[PDB]
Structure formats: C-alpha cells, structure tokens
From a paper:
In order to identify novel CARF effectors, we used Foldseek18 to search for proteins with structural homology to CARF domain of the Cam1 effector. This method rendered a 600-residue protein containing an N-terminal CARF domain followed by a linker region and a C-terminal adenosine deaminase (ADA) domain, with accession number HAJ98955.1 from an unknown Bacteriodales bacterium (hereafter named CRISPR-associated deaminase, CRISPR-associated adenosine deaminase 1 [Cad1]), for which homologs were already identified in a previous bioinformatic screen. cad1 is located immediately downstream the cas10-csm genes of a type III-A CRISPR locus. Further analysis of cad1 homologs showed that over 70% associate in genomes containing type III systems (mostly belonging to the A and B subtypes) and exist within many unique phyla of bacteria. These data suggest that Cad1 is a widespread effector in type III CRISPR-Cas systems.
Next, we used X-ray crystallography to elucidate the molecular details of cOA interactions with Cad1’s CARF domain. We first solved the crystal structure of apo-Cad1-CARF-His6 at 3.6 Å resolution. The structure showed an asymmetric unit composed of a tetramer formed by crystal packing between two Cad1-CARF-His6 dimers in which monomers are arranged in a pseudo-2-fold symmetry. Consistent with these results, SECMALS analysis of Cad1-CARF-His6 showed the formation a stable dimer in solution. Analysis of the electrostatic potential revealed the presence of a positively charged pocket that harbors both K104 residues on top of the C-terminal legs (residues 104–117) on each of the CARF monomers at the dimeric interface. Although both cOA ligands were fully accommodated in the electropositive pocket of apo Cad1-CARF-His6, they affected differently the angle between the two C-terminal legs of the CARF monomers.
Residue numbers in the entry:
A (entry chain C): 1 to 166
B (entry chain A): 2 to 166
The structure:
C-alpha cells in the first residue's frame, strides 16, 4: 500500500520539499499539480527527488493555463484539478494532501476534492522565515522551525471515487 | 438578513471588495481577525462609516497575534467556529468570503461553512491589489475585480443546534 502525496505548487516550488518531510515515515508517490506558468521552477524539485529515487515522482502541467484570473479560468482549473485528483489517488488508500502551494483559489478547490474524494490527512505546512533553497529548508528543519498543521481525516465518498472508471 | 462573514489579516481591502461583489449589498458585516499589529482596521472602518445603513462588527482574537504551530491554529479554529455560529443568522445562511487572512485561516473558515451552512462560499479576486478606496472603486469601475463563487454549502441543522450549548 502506497502513501501518496498530492500537492499544488506555484512560483514558490519549495513547498513540496517541505511537505515530504512533514510526515516522518516518508512517502512513496509524490504528485504535483501546477499551472503551465513559466514562473514554475521544475529544477528545484528535480534535484531533490533525484536523491530519493525510491519515490515515484511526477509533475502534471495544465497546458494552456498560467494565471487563474477570472471565473472561466477557475471553472477550467477546478475541473482539471478534480480529474487529476481521482487518477493519482491510490486505489486501496486515501492520499495525503498538502494545501500550501499556489494561490488561495487553487488551495480552496483542493480542500473540496479531499472532502469529496477522501484524504488520509489533509494538512497545511507553515514556516518561520520561508526557506528559499534546499540548505535553508534543511537547516531550518534542523532548528525546529517548520510546524505541520493537520486539519483532519476526510472520509470522502466511495461512490464519487468510482468516477475514475468513467 | 444577508450576512457577510470574512477572515481578515494584513491586506484589509478584501472586505470592501467582498461587499461590492454581491450586487444588492449586505445589511450585516462581521470580521474575525487576530490581535495583530499589522491589521489596519482604519481603512475598513472609514469605508464602513460612509455606509451608515449597515451593521459592522470586527471581533479581535484577544491574545493571538499570529498562528505559528499546531496549538495556535486549534485556538484559532475553535474561536472561529463559535464566531461563525455566533454571527450566523437564525433563519438564513451567511455569505462567506475566503479572501483575507492566511491559508489556514481560509481553509478553516471553509470547513466552518460546510459544517454549519453558507449561502455562498465565495472568494474575491482582483488584478492590481487595490491599496485604498479610490483605487478599488476605480478597479470595480474598469471591470477588474472578480467575484469567484465556489458553491452553496447546505450545512447540517444537527450541527447548527450546537449553538444552544
């Protein structure tokens, strides 16, 4: 059984190296849903998981969306997010979800998917001085200056999880 | 009565934007903020005094300046859900704006709605980050502020009776 980590990442890609450490045992899968904004930095994350090859790592770009700016873009975003969530979800398990990255309209639609499709532990990650690279986040992990905010198990809907068959 | 409930933090201007993103206006407004120093109540009040046909009530979380660890969020959350059940109408469901505050302020106000009900969980989005009143009324006027509703949350009457303990 696979402890899977689902995330939304924005410009600040450092949030994913911080959500993988916030669960002590570790993780198996790590999937990241981001926009096709050129401000997304794939490099900070492809250096980090290339030192953990026991972690099946993935990044989905929503081709053709960059900045959610009006009502149609969010209707286009929410739907694309909600699809990605059912697929990357494990088949025998609820996933671990991180609400930290992106903009606020990215993160509240992700709260709804976890409540609608289930989530082992919806959680939020806070930091004291905002680490910008891997050393900063490693030495700030070392002095106890990253706290993990848990929000609680989400039972979801077994019926609504069958939607990935259609 | 249509009620508007808003988390607020550093950028105060989300609340007068949330006021105008519902065409008819609001009779009540209630803000739930920490006792931060950065929270500027002055721009809000200056707007909400020019509109004397409304009832405005900020409620400062007395003691909390910032949420930093899992203990400070659980103080925040429990004080938020009382206030959400305090300021909720008796017969109608409130309008909830997830625009101000931090992300754990908004995801908990998010939950609050789903547990108790919310006529409309919405989230106001702008373009240039309006710094003041004249800028916002010019933003509203050039068609740059966006009302992103997210959905009616019917809530649970079996949990709304909980205000009576």
């Amino acid at each position: 059984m696979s402890r899977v980590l689902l995330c939304s990442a924005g410009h600040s890609s450092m949030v994913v190296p911080e959500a993988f450490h916030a669960v002590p045992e570790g993780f198996e899968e790590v999937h990241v849903f981001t926009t096709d904004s050129e401000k997304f930095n794939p490099v900070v994350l492809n250096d980090f998981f290339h030192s953990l090859p026991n972690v099946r790592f993935s990044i989905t770009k929503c081709h053709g969306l960059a900045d959610i700016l009006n009502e149609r873009d969010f209707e286009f975003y929410q739907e694309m997010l909600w699809q990605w969530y059912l697929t990357k979800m494990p088949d025998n398990e609820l996933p671990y979800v991180c609400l930290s990255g992106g903009i606020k309209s990215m993160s509240a639609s992700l709260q709804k998917a976890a409540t609608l499709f289930g989530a082992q532990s919806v959680f939020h990650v806070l930091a004291d001085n905002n680490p910008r690279n891997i050393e900063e986040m490693f030495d700030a992990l070392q002095k106890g200056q990253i706290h993990f905010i848990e929000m609680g198990y989400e039972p979801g809907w077994a019926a609504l999880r069958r939607l990935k068959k259609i």
